[PDB]
């Protein structure tokens, strides 16, 4: 049949420019085998597409923006927070190959991590390590791309690749497909099996060309373009107006600006649907980005615990890392929950536990500790 020959790479920092020096970008950049320096010698992967994504920050948290390769990035000052992104790769993402690389070794030429312990702890590593400053990176990347736990060579019918190309052509301009149009394009080749269409959309999403979620619940948008629909969330998630903690009523045009008011309220609905903020009232917005301890403290657990705004709240009392609650139920109770990123802990002042469990339920074998 016809193979796909495509893959995506998310750079996971805590560096990113250093690995951009091997490219010669605000994520989502495309490269071919000649583009990568040090890996163009191998004609084995001459016709292979590479997709590079990368981010970084403290409150920036986009878990969902196999079928990829994750090069984790480390620096000597950030080694204390190392379990975080590794557990993030283990939980979210997929079963993708992981390449851990330590950068800026010139400032401390004597520091090496215990790569054996983390390699045995994380079975997606398999001793793909580098200790270079600003190459074995090309060898590790090649040995990671061609893996059964990843999709680079996958045999699918050519009609599938025609449908994928047509979907890309439609999505690069429309930026959001309708379910009716999705079915129309799928049946252009006659394919209408829910399983077949689901697998086609999964291979289109996990490769990061056209995104598709199971929690949109919106009839206006079925699939969506990462080149705009993710950068849109990036702009509103931080614009120095959400830093204070509250976004204006409808001043998203001041934030952003191909983007208009129709797209403005499209993305408004999208961001309420992703369970990231709550619209409160009169155009108010939260953007929230006993002793319970979590390894790999999820970045968005306070944004999900602060959705209950028409519930216990004293008065506009939020730390952007915490909040204050005032029970409106029987009797009177005053509560406050606040987070500590440096300790990966959550505090409770005195339903709250029920909401915390309902939020952490969206994790796969996430270890928790109570005290």
């Amino acid at each position, epitope marked *: *049949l016809v*193979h796909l*020959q495509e893959i995506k790479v998310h750079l996971i920092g805590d560096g990113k420019t250093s690995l951009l020096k091997q490219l010669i970008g605000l994520n989502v950049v495309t490269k071919q085998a000649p583009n990568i320096k040090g890996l163009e010698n191998d*004609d*084995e*992967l*001459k*016709e292979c597409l590479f997709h590079f994504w990368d981010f970084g920050g403290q409150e920036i948290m986009h878990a969902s923006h196999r079928s990829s390769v994750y090069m984790l990035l480390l620096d000597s000052r950030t080694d204390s927070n190392k379990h975080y992104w590794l557990r993030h790769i283990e939980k979210y993402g997929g079963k993708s190959p992981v390449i851990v690389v330590m950068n800026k070794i010139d400032e401390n030429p004597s520091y090496n991590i215990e790569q054996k312990k983390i390699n045995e702890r994380f079975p997606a590593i*398999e001793n793909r390590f580098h200790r270079i400053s600003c190459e074995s990176i090309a060898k590790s990347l090649k*040995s990671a791309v*061609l*893996h*059964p736990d990843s*999709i*680079y*060579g*996958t*045999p*699918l*019918a050519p009609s599938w690749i025609k449908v994928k190309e047509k979907l890309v052509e439609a999505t690069t301009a429309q930026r959001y497909l309708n379910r009716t149009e999705v079915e129309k394009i799928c049946n252009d080749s006659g394919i209408t099996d829910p399983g077949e269409r689901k697998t086609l959309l999964g291979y289109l999403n996990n490769l990061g060309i056209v995104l598709y979620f199971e929690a949109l619940d919106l009839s206006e948008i079925y699939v969506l373009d990462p080149h705009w629909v993710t950068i849109g969330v990036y702009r509103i998630i931080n614009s120095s107006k959400t830093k204070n903690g509250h976004l204006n009523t409808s001043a998203l045009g001041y934030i952003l600006n191909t983007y208009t008011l129709l797209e403005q309220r499209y993305l408004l609905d999208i961001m309420k649907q992703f369970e990231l903020c709550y619209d409160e009232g009169k155009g108010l917005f939260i953007i929230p980005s006993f002793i319970m301890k979590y390894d790999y403290l999820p970045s968005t657990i306070i944004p999900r615990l602060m959705i209950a705004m028409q519930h216990q709240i004293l008065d506009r009392m939020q730390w952007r890392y915490g909040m204050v609650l005032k029970s409106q139920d029987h009797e009177g109770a005053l509560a406050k929950v606040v987070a500590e990123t440096k300790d990966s802990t959550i505090t409770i002042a005195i339903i709250i536990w029920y909401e915390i469990k309902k939020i952490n339920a969206n994790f796969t074998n996430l270890d928790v500790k109570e005290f």
Partner: nanobody, 107 residues
Framework: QAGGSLRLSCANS????????MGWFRQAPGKEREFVAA???????????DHADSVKGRFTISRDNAKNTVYLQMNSLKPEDTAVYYC?????????????????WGQ
């Protein structure tokens, strides 16, 4: 001899090729056909190219399209790793990395 070199060549002529992946399997004492190294090479291209256990360097795998052959290079051979190698061909075109689809056993 122990820790030596041994290049094994396995040739296939006039078959599916494009709808075929070549995998080497070592099992002397009825070891249930353990997977060693497979390759879905298509001309100069190569898709699967994965190993197991002994991994790369120890065992090298290559494919040449000049005579349609697959070469397994044995280096640093550990004496207890004594097994007989068989060639297996996979033909299914639905789902990459198909171990159970290695139905057409070789010579």
């Amino acid at each position: 001899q122990a820790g030596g070199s041994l290049r094994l060549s396995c040739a296939n002529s006039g078959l599916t090729f494009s709808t075929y992946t070549m995998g080497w399997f070592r099992q002397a004492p009825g070891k249930e056909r353990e997977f060693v190294a497979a390759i879905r090479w298509s001309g100069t291209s190569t898709y699967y190219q994965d190993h197991a256990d002994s991994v790369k360097g120890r065992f090298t795998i290559s494919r040449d399209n000049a005579k349609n052959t697959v070469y397994l290079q044995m280096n640093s051979l550990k004496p207890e790793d004594t097994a007989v190698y068989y060639c297996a061909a996979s033909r299914l075109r639905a789902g990459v990395k198909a171990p159970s689809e290695y139905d057409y056993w070789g010579q």
